[PDB]
Design a protein around this nucleic acid. Structure first.
Lengths: 65, 125
RNA sequence: UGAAAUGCGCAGAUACCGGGAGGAACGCCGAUGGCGAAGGCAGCCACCUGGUCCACCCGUGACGCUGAGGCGCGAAAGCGUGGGGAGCAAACCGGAUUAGAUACCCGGGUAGUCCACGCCCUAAACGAUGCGCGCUAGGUCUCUGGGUCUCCUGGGGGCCGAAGCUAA
């Protein structure tokens, strides 16, 4: 993501400590990854990256509340 | 014929035979020699590093009349000889030239290679 | 080739020049190097994409570690359908060697090796060394970042070695 699309997502997410912001960033990155994965099914190594992001998101929600 | 003095020498080695041809700065060949050119018969003449040596010299000497002095050597292909001598086959030619009297400006390996023409046999591939 | 022979060549081979077609691999750089969780990954170009290090210490405020079963990935060979097939080459067909040669050597050669989609799931899958964290002399070479850059500091790769450990 570019265009500071990241920044905009960050700013829009919140003044807060960005745990929720983090959730947003992760969802955004994940979606793109899922998108990437739509193609390049073969790309296993990339998938691993998704594994981390999805994992971290899942974990954060639990930790958060 | 018309003195040149500076030119190119192409050494084309092969497992079968060595053929060297000298050329102008332009690329047009002045003269050429091979193991066949000298009277040596097919097996021995053709490859034998000795032959390559003789051919190299014959090429230079003939070129000397052309008034050749300095030359750029280009090596194409690999090959040599069966002979007991070390017989790199190609190297001897490269040597004979340096010695022949012509000053060799440079030795360059530009052995051509196919993109991938056809399958080689001969235990290759 | 140890010597050879099979083999190819006068329908002209080999060696040489030019043109074309096709497949596979990617010399030098290249390392004693780098990347990845492993398997593994090296022509160049663009796009898509994962991991990772460092500086600032700015934000959250224990959100951490490991992880049975699951799920996924997993060299080669191998399997299914289709494609491709230059070189190589199990099987196979010959030549030689030998006491014999179902081998090693030489000439051929099919599957396969390549691509796609699906399957198989193994290995000396090795560092033969599970993951995380803390603590315990140094020296030397190296890759990558920062610094007040003849050295200090962080991450990685090697060598030698304190204490200690070890049956060695």
């Amino acid at each position: 993501i570019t265009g500071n699309k990241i920044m905009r997502i960050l700013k829009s997410n919140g003044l807060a400590p960005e745990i929720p912001e983090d959730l947003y960033y992760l969802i955004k990155k994940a979606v793109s990854v899922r998108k990437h994965l739509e193609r390049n099914r073969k790309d296993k190594d990339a998938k691993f990256r998704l594994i981390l992001i999805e994992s971290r998101i899942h974990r954060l929600a639990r930790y958060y509340r | 014929d018309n003195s040149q003095v500076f030119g190119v020498a192409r050494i084309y080695a092969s497992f079968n035979d060595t053929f060297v041809h000298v050329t102008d700065l332009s690329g047009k060949e002045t003269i050429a020699r091979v193991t066949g050119g000298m009277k040596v018969k097919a097996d021995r003449d053709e490859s034998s590093p000795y032959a390559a040596m003789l051919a190299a010299q014959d090429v230079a000497a003939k070129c000397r009349e052309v008034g050749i002095t300095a030359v750029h050597v280009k090596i194409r292909a690999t090959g040599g000889t069966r002979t007991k001598t070390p017989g790199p086959g190609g190297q001897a030619a490269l040597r004979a030239l340096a010695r022949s009297g012509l000053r060799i400006g440079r030795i360059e390996d530009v052995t051509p290679v196919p993109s991938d023409s056809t399958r080689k046999k001969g235990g290759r591939r």
